[PDB]
Amino acid sequence: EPHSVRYFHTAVSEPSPGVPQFVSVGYLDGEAFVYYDSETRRKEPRADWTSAIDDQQYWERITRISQNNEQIYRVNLETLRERYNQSRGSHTWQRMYGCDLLEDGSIRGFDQYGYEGRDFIALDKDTRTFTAADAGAQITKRKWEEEGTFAETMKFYLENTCIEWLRKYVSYGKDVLERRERPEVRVSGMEADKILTLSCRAHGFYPRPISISWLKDGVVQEQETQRGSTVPNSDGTYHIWATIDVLPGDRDKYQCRVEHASLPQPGLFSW
């Protein structure tokens, strides 16, 4: 029942292959559903539910909004060049903003900006003031809090518009969002110098949260385990592994344990 809508903007002075001058990706509960860049200059879908939105010339309009705003990203890129006394070259401007619905129905909002891969300025919409990270950021704090309008305008969107679209988005993608897909689990064995390296792999689970652990005759082995980060598949599902180094006679005491929302009780797997 909690949900998220976030937009990620990347803007750079010098394009490069696969890096346009400006790109924007919208995510629903972490899965892409809307894309735009300054080469195609067109808002395009990234999820199937977006295809039955019911707004008619919504795509034409939001495309135009984006086309118009990449002017302002180019300006802010030069402002930031001169404010930080850099040369002309490669610089990078980044933005993440959006809203959350928590399980009690309350709302959160965020608007964060990043220059050169470092924090720059963040909205604290509770106080309608910006937290600056910098001498250079302190200016934009003072210019934004002088004019008076942006903080509350962005607080408005975050608390109203954003949330209004979130709920509509959740009900179009109800079926994708609530589907569940079990993991296929396989345990692999490889010993070299009298050390058996057991590798447990969980493929294709949705949703993303997972527990994977290792059991030695039924007792967790939390320090002898290293696990990878949950990483994405191409079809919206996820992937994780967990290895353990153990000794080849201690082989039939070893179980991988996979707790996932898709299974009522944890699965157990051996090699």
């Binding site: 924007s24 705003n69 802010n76 930031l80 969107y157 975050l158």
Partner: peptide, 9 residues
Amino acid sequence: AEAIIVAMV
């Protein structure tokens, strides 16, 4: 939908 008002730095 994206927020229309973008600010300048």
